[PDB]
Structure 1
Amino acid sequence: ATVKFKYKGEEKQVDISKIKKVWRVGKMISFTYDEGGGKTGRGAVSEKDAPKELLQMLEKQK
């Protein structure tokens, strides 16, 4: 369900349903998640750092 991503010294828990657009750029995977009344926050997660759920959809399903 939830993705724990490091910020400075604070690891932030964000839901898989709230990730609006996800894209694999090269060494990193950048993503725009929505959070309230039309105001999108922008996170990032590395290639070894991202575990299994987001990796299976873009290189198997459709």
Structure 2
Amino acid sequence: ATVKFKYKGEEKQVDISKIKKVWRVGKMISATYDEGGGKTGRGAVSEKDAPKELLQMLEKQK
């Protein structure tokens, strides 16, 4: 289950491997992915497009 953003225009799907990590604060949750060196792509994931795997293992569970 991959973190796919993209509400109105742009096509490209973002994979769950390349991730800079925020995923907590408030109503607007900032989408951060490592592109190459250090140039991060800003976006939005509120509640409907967010996957199951990020909620259960946040935080690695044995």
Gaps of 5+ in 2: none
Return the structure number with greater strand share: 1
* Bigger relative CO (Cα 8 Å, ≥ 6 apart): 2
The structure carrying a bigger helix percent of its residues is 1
The TM-score with structure 1 as length reference comes to: 0.65
Task: Please report the RMSD computed on the Cα atoms of aligned residues, expressed in angstroms.
Answer: 2.6
Q: Which runs of 4+ in 1 moved over 4 A?
A: none
Structure 1 unaligned regions, length at least 5 = none
SS at match of 1:3: coil
- Cα separation, partners in 2 of 1:48 and 1:59, compared to 1, 3 Å: farther
Q: Using the aligned pairs only, state the percent identity.
A: 98
**Post-superposition offset of 1:50:** 0.7
